[PDB]
Every structure is written in structure tokens, then in C-alpha cells.
Design an enzyme around this catalytic site. Structure first.
Site, PDB file in Angstrom:
ATOM      1  CG  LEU B  36      55.450  66.506  34.653  1.00  0.00           C
ATOM      2  CD1 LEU B  36      54.207  67.348  34.449  1.00  0.00           C
ATOM      3  CD2 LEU B  36      56.577  67.339  35.231  1.00  0.00           C
ATOM      4  CG  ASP B  37      58.909  63.325  39.900  1.00  0.00           C
ATOM      5  OD1 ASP B  37      59.175  62.453  39.051  1.00  0.00           O
ATOM      6  OD2 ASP B  37      59.764  64.100  40.373  1.00  0.00           O
ATOM      7  CB  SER B  38      52.860  60.886  41.722  1.00  0.00           C
ATOM      8  OG  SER B  38      54.003  60.192  42.176  1.00  0.00           O
ATOM      9  CB  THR B  41      51.303  65.215  39.142  1.00  0.00           C
ATOM     10  OG1 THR B  41      52.169  64.318  38.441  1.00  0.00           O
ATOM     11  CG2 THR B  41      50.009  65.371  38.375  1.00  0.00           C
TER      12      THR B  41
END
Ligand SMILES: CCCCCCCCCCCCCCCCCC(=O)OC[C@H](COP(=O)(O)OCCN)OC(=O)CCCCCCCCCCCCCCCCC
Ligand SMILES: NC(=O)C1=CN([C@@H]2O[C@H](COP(=O)(O)OP(=O)(O)OC[C@H]3O[C@@H](n4cnc5c(N)ncnc54)[C@H](OP(=O)(O)O)[C@@H]3O)[C@@H](O)[C@H]2O)C=CC1
Ligand code: SF4
Lengths: 318, 77, 110, 169, 86, 340, 76, 116, 78
Positions: B36-38, B41
């Protein structure tokens, strides 16, 4: 008539040179097509009949792209003048009710015959005539009978006859598709209280008429503009009453008892619900097996309900 | 706590980009376990707080990295 | 009958008449585009409005028959107005809005 | 049905009109008489507009008594230049306005953009926004000019022929 | 005296079955005090001059202060004028 | 039965045609007061503007999705019915001896002038706009606070009367020209009279575009002419009501008409004339009163709500309670009380 | 071509009746001004308006607009 | 001497701190999406708002300099400031949303042949 | 704690000779916070006279402050 590359440009006043003439166009459908037509630099002769109603079609373009002429289907000379200089011509025409001066005949038959005779006398390329859904030659809605006669007359002379048959339409200020849903004091009709058919959104009708009115290789074909998926009945009233007020209140009256209001309707200042509409409530979409559609002219018209969420939302409770 | 993470593993499953719900162990990471991308997230963090109708402060959004932390903050009401 | 009942009956129908003229011939075609806060002086004014009405309702029969009560109804209503005017001298001391933000204190240095 | 009597008729131009010219001229005279706007009033041209409320070239000798409310209005004098920023507010004012509505473009900037017209932030004429029925030229047009445009608008009102257009002339 | 008992009873059992809107209950309790005066006034009319109608002007003057204290107390059914709460 | 319905039609057409040309009258007199000329163009002379404006502004009729039509389609009709017209049920000295009213005058006018206030309040209740209804509550609050000191002063001037039927005030006042000559609190009645029917120098809830480009609701159409006509008709009614009690009807030339009618007519020729000069007296006492309304429209600016409630509940009302600590006192002192 | 203007900066303020108007002109040395910045009291008094308006009512604020000469054709 | 929704202007130094600050900005800018759809009455759905906000921040994923990312942060937080209340209007607001296709008709299929 | 609402003061005609869009917040009909909002009329003269000559500049220049015209002419000319 010969042109350059395609329809869709990327900027206004990059003008075409196509000189169109749209009949009617003060009211419902003819707003959006000349809105799509003057947006991309085409000269429009829009004739009218009422001076105070023609105004809100001027702001679609800036200069020379909207013009007013004082036509009237009685006057030969007015329509003769109206399309002297034109290049393409569409007629959306025809009230959904007789006037105190017009029959259902000669508002889209001999009214159509006059203007098509002017087309043939002026050799106007790309004559497009709208006509109703379910346009038979049978009696039961003499509206539909008259539209069938009108299509017959537009095919009698002028083989340049692109006839288009839209479905019941669906847009802002729907004359008798959603005004009888939105205001709707007691929408009460439809003895057969279900069993209607295809709705089509209005900007999709306008996009269809726009993408037909410029390309060639479509002369003398007839189109029918089908509903996208649903072909649904008066149960969409329930989806209309999915908005919280549920004031729709269909009371499913007897047929011959319903005539009197329509016979009241001829006496009134304003039009209401004339009986060819009541007869069309017994009809459905007698869908043509062979007529080219949105998939032929490369469009996909939008569905009903999610568009209805936008289209009726002044009218919520809180 | 019980079946709060049922709702969370319903919302995150309803969220896209996670092609394997069997890869969703509940007590597991976000960006290590599922990539998952920050940005994504805190996107799913705001999705979680919008599902339970609850509002979180900034440091509570800062500390969330696994959903056991998320359930542990869900426990605060 | 026949005296003013005609007026209070004719007038509602005239109101519906000049209403219901233009409900039909005006063009509608309605296109589109057509908690809270407070103060004490927005509420207490109308609350304290009511007792000072119905003391006038108290005073109204006395001023109807000021006679038949001579030398004595004057005394009673003077006592009534004394007991009411002291309520007025209670409420003169407080009822006003207060501007919240206006400060003036002297400035000091070390 | 299936046959047609309807011949070649005249333009909307007549004189044989029983009672409809009279009734229509009464209603048209009522509309032509009071005639109040709502001020939109953006710039210098609004200073000349309030000079029409000045005692020299008075509005109230004609009937022009403007309210500050877009529902109680008839015509909407756009005066002053029209920014890019304003124009949605202007069209939203225009829509909440009853159906017998007209627009006066008071001032050169209000029609065809006028003296700026080459800004990023100006609208090149209110024809891009609202339909207009009478233009008024020039930076600030005279109080004379605004009243002349008003009388020309009322002269247009005297040809509205709405009742005999119900009769389909 | 049908005319006053019926409005009194309907105000009363409206005040009973009032599972909505505290102020409708409050005004039903108000309309009790004019359901009672239609009893009192017609008993005085069936009798005489001012014996019970003195009590009628009393209950009107006092029903005013009833509604006044009821409003000025209903304002304090909460915090005062308005703040954060829940 | 036929005579009284043609009576009531004459009186209704008098009041309606009256309040029609009153707006043209006030605009003319503002204009001369503003050093210009009023409506000087309409049709045949320039007396006709409102009579064309009424036909003009019928044919608009908008509705608003923020509000039920069922209240605002009736609430300006409410104050048109009750505040404007059936205040004339009392026939506020229908200027002869006779009226179209049986009796029990002044508190009926009190009740209907009281009844107009929530006609204003429910009007402002509409549209559910959080900036609107507070302005409505402002308007209605100042409206009732000056209703109270109309009420508590015209109940104390009838302490020189004690009779509650309409005429007995008027036959009482012909001896002294009782109305203002014994007491000048007429002027505070006058400054009360601009507030309880707000056509005022106050203009207070007419913050016309201080709100979101609308003041009351902008209920334009037939409710607009209803509100407009009822405001002006409330003005001429409360102005008549001033000329009813605390300004006088029955001018003293009719008292001197004993020295005039006995030199003019022989014996009661169909009462042909005296009602006409009596009407002339009351009309010139009424229009000269409202000429001061049209002054105070264009003399002093708006009046600042907090100071307006200051002007009610702090100054005028304690002066008032002093003033009927003395008018029961002084007549008790000097000689005695009035009978009925 | 207009005319020659010598190069450089200047600023000049006079008291217009709404306040000190300043004009700040950086001239290129050419036919046309390389920069002109106006300075308007109706852009400064409007800026001060929030610090002045606090602790009042709305009909106070209507008057306090008109006192400080807020004719918004002198904003930009 | 005031704010409207606490717009602060103070650019930090370290790129990690700017990362966290843009992250919290993204959370508020994403949380306000049903408030946006309430406030402006769009046709499309709240997930359309969310995927386009994600699109807008992925437009500047690979921008190197923190001293460019500062004024990008200011632009982001500032347009959040002008969106969180009703400064922007819906005609001003649709300038982010190329929503409909049917406005264009048939158009360029990004071929060389149909440039002509 | 404070829970205050806001209004928009003038779209078109609140104060005459001003498009006074004032976003004004109230608690007790007290202006605790004031946020003037002007700039609706950014006609952009400040840009436009960068491409105009000096003789051409002046009829731009009294279009600013349109109630004191030739004084603004005079300050530009000085
Ligand atoms: C003694 C023997 C006789 C005994 C009987 C006595 C009967 C006497 C008759 C009644 C007495 C008249 C009393 C008049 C009350 C007016 C008082 C008043 O207005 O107070 C001023 C007050 C000022 O406000 P404020 O700042 O709060 O004052 C504190 C200053 N440190 O409040 C204000 O803000 C002023 C607002 C006033 C608004 C008036 C608007 C114009 C009205 C003028 C039209 C009237 C002219 C036409 C009638 C005249 C006919 C001749
Ligand atoms: N239920 C429906 O309405 C459906 C519509 N259609 C077809 O679409 C066409 C356009 O629909 P729509 O936009 O609603 O049409 P409009 O309601 O907009 O009316 C057409 C315009 O043409 C005017 N017009 C032209 N000739 C005459 C004439 N002899 N007599 C009176 N008026 C005339 C009309 O009045 P005026 O002269 O005053 O300008 C009107 O303004 C219709 O004609 C119909 O055949 C097809 C499917 C469903
Ligand atoms: S039209 Fe002329 S007077 Fe009006 S704003 Fe533009 S420049 Fe000024």
C-alpha cells in the site's frame, strides 16, 4: 456541400462555415442542439414565432452564429426566405397538442411538406427531419398517425431525408416526462398504469443529432434513438419517488372518464394533457428492427437513474 | 473489538488494489503485506474513520501502520 | 347580520381573488436556481413583553369603569402601579447588550 | 382530418385586430409604465446609474424605482465592467428572476468587453453570460444615454404583441 | 359544557400520548387553560353577572405568566444560549 | 340588505382606490421634498402609476424550493386580510355620526393591530435560512415592543372617556378639541406609530442587500402586492386611528355650524351636506397627519436595533408609567372622574 | 511611439480625497512603463476593516464601510 | 488578526517533515470530500472526488526539490482553504473535472492520420 | 466554546458603488471575526498598462477610483 477534417474542434470561434437552420428551437430539444452547434463555430439561422422566448438561445455563441427570422408555417414566403442561404436544415417541430388554430395535420405533414418543398426548390443538402417514436400509420394516437404521414411526405419528395425517431426524452424541463414528475400535483393518468418504454437523455439526443448533421454517407437512412438499457415502464415513477417526497399519487382512472379533462384542455389559456397523449399511454415503443442507432453513429447514451439523481435534485425535502 | 475487524476487513476488501483477500491476514501490515502506498495508507485510514463515523486526531493517523493498531484505536469508543 | 359581517366575509374572498388572478396567467416554467446562534436581548425582550401586555389587560377594566370606583379605585390602582413600577426599576439595571471585545489596560515594561 | 386550409399569411404585422391590440396594449402599458430594475452596479457606470436617480434626469419621473432584490425585479441593468470572477454570481442572479425579464448592458465594458477586454480576469462582454435586449454604448454613457436606452427598451416593449401571439399571428 | 370538556380532554390525552415534540405537549398544556374557560364562561352566562368571570379574567392574566415562565424555563432545558455539548 | 352591500362596496372602493393612489402621493411628496418630481409620465396625467403597477407586478409569481408555498402564499394574504382591511371593521370614525360598525370600538382595533404581528413573524419564518429568521425575530421583537406602547397609551387616553364604544370618544372630544390640546403625547404616539406599522425612519428589517441580496424573503408576485398594499393600508389605518382618538375628528367648524347650518338650510333637507363637511374635516386631519410620515421617511436615517430596544424598554415606557401616574392623579385632584 | 521617458524608479503620493494615493512606477527608459503599481486607500482601509469592525453589530458595519470610503473600483 | 480555516505559512527544512505535512494535508483534503459534494451538489460520486484527488497528488509524486515542494504544499493547503468553505462556486469548482465526453463529439484518436 | 456561523454580506447592492463580497462571521450578532473579501473587481489595470504607452495609460488610470477621476489623473501625471 464539401468541408474539412471533422466535427470536433478544440476551440470556439475556430468557425466552420456550415450554415445551419433549425426550426422550432425556442423550446425543449432545440436548446441543446443549437447549444452544441453554435459552440463550435457554425452559423445558425434560428427562426421563431414569439419574440420573448427566442432570447435565451443567443448566448450559445458570440457573433453571427445566432440569427432570428420571423417564420410562420402559414407563410410560404417566410420559410422560402428562411433557408435561401442555408447549408443544412433540421426541423424539430410539432406541438404535442392541437392549438386553437392548428390541426394535428399540417403541423408536421403539410407544415413539413412546405418546408421540404422549399428544401427541394433550394437544393439544400442534408435535410434532417425528426419524427416521433412509434410513428405508425395506424390510428390509435393520431399524433403517431400524423408523424407517420409526415415521414411518408418527407420521403415522397426529397430523397435527402434523414429521418430520426427519438424515444421519450429526458432532460432539464422535460415537457411531459419529468414536469409531470417534478411539479406533479396529482399525476393520475395511464389506465394501463405501467407498460411504457425507452427513455433517452436529451443531451444524448442532441449529441446524436449533432453527429448525424455533419457527417455524410448517411443520406436517406432513418434512425431510431433507443433507450440505452432499461426500456422501463412507469415503475421509474417509483425511482422518481425514490426522492423522499413520494407525491406522485397515480390514481389509475378509467379511460373514457379521463377524456373530459382533455376535452377541458382545448378551452384553457395554457396547454395541459391533450388526448393523443392519453392514447399514447396505451401504446409502447414499437421498436423498428432495422434503423441505425447510437452504436451506428458511435455513441453510448447515458442510463436513467444516476442521471436522474442530478436531473431531479432541486426537489428534495431537506 | 469482536467483529470490528470484520467490518475493517470488509471495508479494505471493498477497497481496490488488493487482489488477494486471502493475503489479508487481519493482524498484518499495510505497506509490507499488501504494498500500500503511503498516500494510500492514510487514504484507507480516512476510509476506515468514515465507515465507523468516527473522527481521529493527527497523531492517531500518524501511528497507524497495521490494522491491529487500527482496531486498538477503534476500541477507544 | 347585514352590518359588518359582510365585511369580514367579503374580504377573505377578495384576498383569494387578487391572489388567484395571477396564479394562472403568470409564466412559471421554474428552471433551476430558485444550528444557530443567540443573544439574551433577542429572547428576554419578547419574554418580558408578555407580562407588560397583560397588566394592561389588568388595567383595562379599571379604565373602563373608572367611575363607580371613586376615591378608592384610584388608591388600589396606584398600589398596583407601584408594585409594577418596582419591577420596572428592577429591569432597568440590566437589559442591554454588551460589546464583548474592547480592551484597555496600560502597558508595562521590565 | 388529413387536409389543410391554411394559406400564405402575413408577417407579425396587422391592424384588423379586434380587442387583442387593446388588451395587449393595456397589459403592455402596465409593464411599460412601472419598469423597475435591480441594481447590479459594478463600477463607474453605476455612478452614472445613480446619477439617473439624481434630480436632474430623475428616474421617478418615468417610474424607475429599483429594489435591491432579484425576484422583485424586471430588468437587470448590468453596469460597470464584468470580471471573470463575477460572472457566475451574475448568472445566478439572472436565473432567480421572473420570466418577463430583460437585460440592459449599460456601459461599453458590459458589452463586447469594452476598455479592458484584454484582461485575463475580464469577461469579453456579457453576451457570453446573459442574453441582452438593449445595449448602451460607451464609457460612462450619459444619464441621457441610459434614459435613451430605457425609452428604446420601452419602445421595444410596445411591440411585444404577446396576447395576439397567443392568437398565433 | 360539552364545548369545554371536549377540548380539555383532548388536550389532556394529547399531553399523555405525545411521544414527539416537547413543545406540542407544552401547548396542549396551554390549551387546557382555555378548555377550562369555555366551561367557566358559559357557567357564568347561564348564571349571572361577574362571579365566575372574575376567576376567568384571573386565569387569563395568570395563564400569561404560565406561558412566560414556561418559555423562559424551556430556554434553560440545556446549556444556555449556545456552546459545545456532545 | 341591498343598501348596506352597496354601502360596503362604496367604502371598500374608497379605501382601496385610496391606498392605491396613496403610494403615488407619497412618492410625489418625497420627490418635491427631494427637490425633484415624482411620477409625472404615466398615461393621462401622472396620477396613475400605482394603478398600472398593480397590473404590472401581477404576472410574476416565483416559488422557492427552500420553503412550503402553503405558508407564504397565505401569509401576505393574512396581513392583507386582517391587518389592512378588517381593521376598518371598526369604521374608525367613518367620518359621520354613523358607521358601518355596531359598537365596542377601540379594543377591536387593538386586537387586529395586535393580530398583524405574527403575520409579519410567520412571513419571516420562511425559507429556513439561518441568516433570515434571526432578522425575522428582530423585526417581530421591535414590532411587539412598540405595540405595547401604542397599547398602554391609548388605554390611558380613554381614561378621559371610560366608554369603550367607538363614537363616545368622538362626541367627548368635541368640547375641548380634547385630542392634542390637553395632552401633547400625541407626538410619542406618533413616534410609536411609525414603529408598530413599520413604514418608518427605522427601516430596520429592510436590510435589503445586507443579507444575501434579499431582505424579507423576496416573495415577489401577488404576495408582493399583498404585502405592499397591506403595509400602506396599515399606515392609513393607524394614521386614521391617530386621527380617531388622540388626534381629533369632528373639526370645530361643525360645532360652529350651529351658526352656519342655521344660516344655510331650513329644516333637514335629506342631511345633504353635514356628513360631507364632516368627512372633509376627518380627511384633512388624516392626510395632513400622514404627510408627516412622508416627512420622516426622508428626514432621519435608520435606527440601529439595540438602540431601538433601548428606545422602547428604557426611556419611553417609564415616562409613560409616570404619565399615567398623573392622569389618574390630576383629574382626581383638580375636580373628579369621568362617567360613561 | 508615445515618448521618451528617462529610466529608473519613482513613487509619488498625493492625498486623494479617499486617502493617500501612491503611484509607484518603474520606467524602463523606453516608450512604455516597465512596471506600474497603484496604491489605494480603498485597498488599505479595506485591509484594516477586520481590525476595526470587531465588537459591533451588522448595522454598525454598514456605516463603517461608508466611513472609510470603500468604493471598490479602487481595489486593484 | 484572524484566519478562516487556520492557514499557516511556515516551510520546514527536512523532506521527511514535509512528507508528513503533505500527508496530513492529504487526509484533510480527502476527508472534506462529502463536505464538498454537499456544498457544491456535483453529479458524480464521492469516489470520483477521491480518485481525482489521488490523481492530482500523483501528478507531483516525482518532484525532486523540497524548495519546490514547499510552494506546492502552499498551493495544496491554500486551495483546500478556498474549498473548505464557499469561496469557490460550482462554476469555479468544475475547472478540476473533465467529466463528460459527449461535449466533444468525435475527435482526435491521437493518430497522425486524423490530425488531417 | 464558540460555535459561530457566517454570512455573505453583499453580492450586488449592499453598499452602493461597491461589489462588497464580505464573508462575515457572527456569534451573537457580534463581529468577533471580520474577513473582508474584496477583489471581485480585479479588472487588471496593473497588468494592462505594462503594454500601453504613457499617453494611452491615463484613461486606464482614472478608471481606478471612479469618483475622484482627475485627481487620479493628477497623481499619475505627477
Ligand atoms: C409638563 C406638563 C404636561 C404634562 C404632560 C406631559 C406630556 C408631554 C408629551 C410627551 C413628552 C414627549 C417625550 C418625548 C420622548 C422622546 C425622548 C427621547 O427621544 O430621548 C432621546 C433618546 C436619545 O438616545 P440616548 O443616547 O440613549 O440618550 C442618552 C444620551 N446621554 O432617544 C433617541 O434615540 C431619539 C430617537 C427619537 C426618534 C424620533 C424620530 C423623529 C420624530 C419626529 C417626528 C415628530 C414631529 C411631528 C409631531 C410634532 C407635532 C407638533
Ligand atoms: N413527448 C415528446 O414531446 C417527444 C418529442 N419528440 C419530437 O421532438 C420534437 C421536439 O420536441 P420539443 O423540443 O419538446 O418541441 P417543443 O416543445 O420545443 O416545440 C417545438 C417548437 O416549435 C414551435 N412550432 C413550430 N411549428 C409550429 C406550429 N405550426 N404551430 C405552433 N408551434 C410551432 C413550437 O411553438 P412556437 O411556434 O411558439 O415556437 C415550439 O416552440 C417534437 O416535435 C417531437 O415530434 C419525439 C419523442 C418524444
Ligand atoms: S464601460 Fe466605461 S465607465 Fe463602465 S466600467 Fe468600463 S470603463 Fe468604466
Amino acid at each position: 456541400g464539401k468541408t474539412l477534417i471533422a466535427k470536433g474542434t478544440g476551440g470556439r470561434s475556430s468557425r466552420t462555415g456550415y450554415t445551419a437552420t433549425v426550426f422550432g428551437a425556442n423550446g425543449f430539444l432545440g436548446s441543446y442542439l443549437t447549444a452544441k452547434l453554435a459552440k463550435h463555430g457554425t452559423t445558425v439561422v434560428v427562426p421563431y414565432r414569439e419574440e420573448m422566448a427566442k432570447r435565451h438561445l443567443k448566448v450559445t455563441g458570440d457573433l453571427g452564429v445566432v440569427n432570428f427570422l420571423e417564420m410562420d408555417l402559414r407563410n410560404l414566403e417566410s420559410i422560402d426566405e428562411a433557408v435561401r442561404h442555408s447549408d443544412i436544415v433540421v426541423n424539430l417541430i410539432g406541438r404535442e397538442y392541437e392549438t386553437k388554430n392548428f390541426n394535428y395535420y399540417d403541423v408536421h405533414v403539410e407544415g413539413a411538406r412546405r418546408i421540404a418543398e422549399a428544401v427541394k426548390k433550394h437544393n439544400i443538402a442534408r435535410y434532417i427531419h425528426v419524427s416521433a417514436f412509434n410513428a405508425e400509420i395506424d390510428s390509435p394516437s393520431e399524433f403517431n398517425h400524423t408523424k407517420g404521414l409526415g415521414e411518408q411526405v418527407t420521403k415522397d419528395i426529397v430523397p435527402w431525408a434523414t429521418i430520426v425517431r427519438p424515444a421519450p426524452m429526458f432532460g432539464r424541463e422535460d415537457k411531459w416526462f419529468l414536469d409531470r414528475m417534478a411539479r406533479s400535483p396529482c399525476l393520475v393518468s395511464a389506465n394501463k398504469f405501467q407498460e411504457t418504454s425507452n427513455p433517452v437523455h436529451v443531451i444524448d439526443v442532441a449529441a446524436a443529432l449533432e453527429r448525424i448533421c455533419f457527417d455524410d454517407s448517411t443520406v436517406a437512412q432513418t434512425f431510431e434513438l433507443y433507450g440505452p438499457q432499461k426500456f422501463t415502464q412507469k415503475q421509474i415513477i417509483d425511482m422518481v419517488s425514490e426522492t423522499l417526497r413520494k407525491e406522485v399519487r397515480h390514481i389509475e382512472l378509467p379511460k373514457a372518464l379521463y377524456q373530459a379533462y382533455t376535452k377541458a384542455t382545448q378551452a384553457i389559456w395554457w396547454p395541459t394533457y391533450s388526448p393523443d397523449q392519453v392514447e399514447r399511454q396505451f401504446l409502447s415503443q414499437k421498436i423498428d428492427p432495422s434503423a441505425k442507432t447510437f452504436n451506428d453513429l458511435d455513441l453510448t447514451p447515458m442510463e436513467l437513474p444516476d442521471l436522474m439523481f442530478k436531473l431531479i435534485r432541486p426537489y428534495r425535502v431537506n | 473489538r469482536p467483529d470490528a475487524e470484520k467490518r475493517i476487513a470488509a471495508v479494505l476488501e471493498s477497497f481496490d488494489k488488493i487482489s488477494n483477500p486471502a493475503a489479508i491476514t487481519p493482524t498484518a501490515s499495510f505497506a509490507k503485506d499488501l504494498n500500500l502506498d503511503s498516500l494510500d495508507t492514510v487514504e484507507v485510514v480516512v476510509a476506515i474513520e468514515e465507515e465507523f463515523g468516527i473522527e481521529i486526531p493527527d497523531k492517531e493517523a500518524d501511528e497507524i501502520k497495521s490494522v491491529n493498531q487500527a482496531v486498538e484505536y477503534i476500541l477507544a469508543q | 347580520m347585514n352590518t359588518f359581517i359582510i365585511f369580514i366575509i367579503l374580504i377573505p374572498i377578495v384576498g383569494f381573488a387578487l391572489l388567484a388572478v395571477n396564479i394562472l396567467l403568470a409564466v412559471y416554467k421554474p428552471y433551476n436556481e430558485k444550528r444557530l446562534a443567540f443573544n439574551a436581548a433577542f429572547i428576554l425582550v419578547a419574554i418580558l413583553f408578555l407580562p407588560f401586555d397583560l397588566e394592561i389587560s389588568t388595567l383595562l377594566p379599571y379604565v373602563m369603569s373608572i367611575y363607580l370606583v371613586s376615591n378608592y379605585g384610584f388608591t388600589i390602582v396606584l398600589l398596583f402601579l407601584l408594585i409594577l413600577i418596582i419591577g420596572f426599576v428592577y429591569e432597568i439595571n440590566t437589559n442591554a447588550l454588551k460589546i464583548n471585545k474592547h480592551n484597555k489596560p496600560n502597558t508595562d515594561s521590565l | 382530418p388529413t387536409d389543410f386550409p391554411l394559406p400564405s399569411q402575413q408577417k407579425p404585422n396587422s391592424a384588423v385586430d379586434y380587442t387583442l391590440t387593446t388588451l395587449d396594449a393595456v397589459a403592455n402599458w402596465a409593464r411599460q409604465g412601472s419598469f423597475w430594475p435591480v441594481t447590479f452596479g459594478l463600477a463607474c457606470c453605476a455612478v452614472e446609474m445613480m446619477h439617473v436617480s439624481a434630480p436632474r434626469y430623475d428616474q421617478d419621473r418615468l417610474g424607475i424605482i429599483f429594489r435591491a432584490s432579484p425576484r422583485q425585479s424586471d430588468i437587470m441593468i448590468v453596469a460597470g465592467t464584468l470580471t471573470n470572477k463575477m460572472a457566475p454570481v451574475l448568472r445566478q442572479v439572472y436565473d432567480q428572476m421572473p420570466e418577463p425579464r430583460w437585460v440592459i448592458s449599460m456601459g461599453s465594458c458590459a458589452n463586447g468587453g469594452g476598455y479592458y477586454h484584454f484582461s485575463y480576469s475580464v469577461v469579453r462582454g456579457c453576451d457570453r453570460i446573459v442574453p441582452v435586449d438593449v445595449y448602451v454604448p460607451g464609457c460612462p454613457p450619459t444619464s441621457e444615454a441610459l434614459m435613451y436606452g430605457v425609452f428604446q427598451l420601452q419602445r421595444k416593449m410596445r411591440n411585444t404583441k404577446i396576447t395576439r401571439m397567443w392568437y398565433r399571428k | 359544557m360539552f364545548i369545554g370538556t371536549i377540548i380539555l380532554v383532548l388536550s389532556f390525552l394529547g399531553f399523555v400520548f405525545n411521544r414527539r415534540n416537547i413543545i406540542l405537549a407544552f401547548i396542549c398544556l396551554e390549551t387546557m387553560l382555555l378548555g377550562i374557560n369555555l366551561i367557566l364562561l358559559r357557567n357564568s352566562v347561564l348564571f349571572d353577572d361577574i362571579s365566575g368571570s372574575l376567576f376567568a379574567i384571573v386565569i387569563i392574566i395568570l395563564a400569561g405568566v404560565e406561558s412566560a415562565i414556561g418559555l423562559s424555563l424551556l430556554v434553560s432545558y440545556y446549556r444556555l444560549r449556545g456552546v459545545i455539548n456532545s | 340588505m341591498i343598501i348596506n352591500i352597496v354601502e360596503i362596496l362604496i367604502f371598500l372602493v374608497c379605501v382601496l382606490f385610496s391606498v392605491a393612489y396613496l403610494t403615488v402621493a407619497e412618492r410625489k411628496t418625497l420627490a418635491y421634498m427631494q427637490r425633484r418630481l415624482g411620477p409625472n409620465f404615466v398615461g393621462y396625467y401622472g396620477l396613475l402609476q400605482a394603478f398600472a403597477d398593480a397590473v404590472k407586478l401581477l404576472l410574476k409569481e416565483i416559488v422557492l424550493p427552500k420553503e412550503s408555498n402553503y405558508i407564504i402564499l397565505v401569509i401576505s394574504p393574512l396581513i392583507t386580510l386582517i391587518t389592512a382591511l378588517i381593521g376598518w371593521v371598526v369604521i374608525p370614525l367613518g367620518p359621520g355620526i354613523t358607521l358601518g360598525e355596531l359598537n365596542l370600538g377601540i379594543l377591536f382595533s387593538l386586537a387586529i393591530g395586535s393580530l398583524g404581528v405574527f403575520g409579519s413573524l410567520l412571513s419571516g419564518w420562511s425559507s429556513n435560512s439561518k441568516y433570515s429568521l434571526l432578522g425575522s425575530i428582530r423585526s417581530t421583537a421591535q414590532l411587539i415592543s412598540y405595540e405595547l406602547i401604542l397599547t398602554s397609551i391609548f388605554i390611558i387616553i380613554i381614561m378621559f372617556v371610560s366608554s369603550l364604544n367607538i363614537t363616545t370618544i368622538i362626541e367627548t372630544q368635541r368640547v375641548v378639541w380634547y385630542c392634542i390640546p390637553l395632552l401633547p403625547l400625541l407626538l410619542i404616539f406618533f413616534i410609536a406609530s411609525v414603529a408598530e406599522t413599520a413604514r418608518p425612519p427605522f427601516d430596520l428589517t429592510e436590510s435589503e442587500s445586507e443579507l444575501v441580496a434579499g431582505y424579507f424573503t423576496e416573495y415577489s408576485g401577488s404576495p408582493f402586492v399583498f404585502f405592499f398594499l397591506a403595509e400602506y393600508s396599515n399606515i392609513i389605518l393607524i394614521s386614521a386611528f391617530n386621527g380617531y382618538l388622540l388626534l381629533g375628528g369632528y373639526l370645530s367648524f361643525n360645532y360652529s355650524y350651529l351658526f352656519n347650518i342655521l344660516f344655510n338650510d331650513y329644516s333637514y333637507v335629506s342631511f345633504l351636506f353635514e356628513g360631507l363637511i364632516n368627512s372633509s374635516a376627518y380627511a384633512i386631519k388624516l392626510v395632513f397627519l400622514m404627510f408627516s410620515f412622508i416627512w420622516v421617511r426622508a428626514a432621519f436615517p435608520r435606527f440601529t436595533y439595540d438602540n431601538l430596544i433601548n428606545f422602547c424598554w428604557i426611556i419611553l415606557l417609564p415616562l409613560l408609567f409616570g404619565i399615567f401616574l398623573i392622569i389618574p392623579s390630576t383629574l382626581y385632584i383638580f375636580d373628579s372622574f369621568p362617567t360613561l | 511611439k508615445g515618448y521618451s521617458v528617462p529610466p529608473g524608479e519613482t513613487y509619488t503620493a498625493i492625498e486623494a480625497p479617499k486617502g493617500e494615493m501612491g503611484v509607484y512606477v518603474v520606467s524602463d527608459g523606453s516608450e512604455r512603463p516597465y512596471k506600474c503599481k497603484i496604491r489605494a486607500p480603498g485597498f488599505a482601509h479595506l485591509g484594516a476593516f477586520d481590525h476595526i469592525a470587531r465588537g459591533h453589530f451588522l448595522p454598525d458595519a454598514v456605516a463603517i464601510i461608508g466611513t472609510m470610503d470603500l468604493v471598490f473600483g479602487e481595489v486593484d | 488578526i484572524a484566519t478562516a480555516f487556520a492557514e499557516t505559512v511556515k516551510f520546514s527544512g527536512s523532506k521527511q517533515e514535509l512528507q508528513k505535512r503533505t500527508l496530513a494535508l492529504y487526509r484533510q483534503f480527502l476527508r472534506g470530500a462529502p463536505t464538498f459534494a454537499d456544498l457544491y451538489e456535483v453529479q458524480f460520486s464521492i469516489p470520483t472526488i477521491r480518485t481525482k484527488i489521488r490523481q492530482e497528488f500523483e501528478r507531483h509524486r516525482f518532484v525532486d526539490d523540497l524548495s519546490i515542494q514547499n510552494v506546492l504544499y502552499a498551493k495544496g493547503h491554500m486551495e483546500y482553504q478556498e474549498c473548505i468553505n464557499f469561496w469557490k462556486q460550482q462554476a469555479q469548482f468544475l475547472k478540476y473535472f473533465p467529466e463528460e465526453d459527449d461535449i466533444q463529439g468525435r475527435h482526435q484518436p491521437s493518430n497522425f492520420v486524423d490530425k488531417f | 466554546r464558540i460555535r459561530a456561523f457566517t454570512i455573505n454580506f453583499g453580492p450586488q447592492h449592499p453598499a452602493a458603488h461597491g461589489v462588497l463580497r464580505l464573508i462575515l462571521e457572527l456569534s451573537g450578532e457580534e463581529i468577533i471575526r471580520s474577513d473582508p473579501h474584496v477583489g471581485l473587481l480585479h479588472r487588471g489595470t496593473e497588468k494592462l498598462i505594462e503594454y500601453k504607452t504613457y499617453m494611452q495609460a491615463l484613461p486606464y488610470f482614472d478608471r481606478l477610483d471612479y469618483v475622484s477621476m482627475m485627481t487620479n489623473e493628477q497623481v499619475f501625471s505627477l
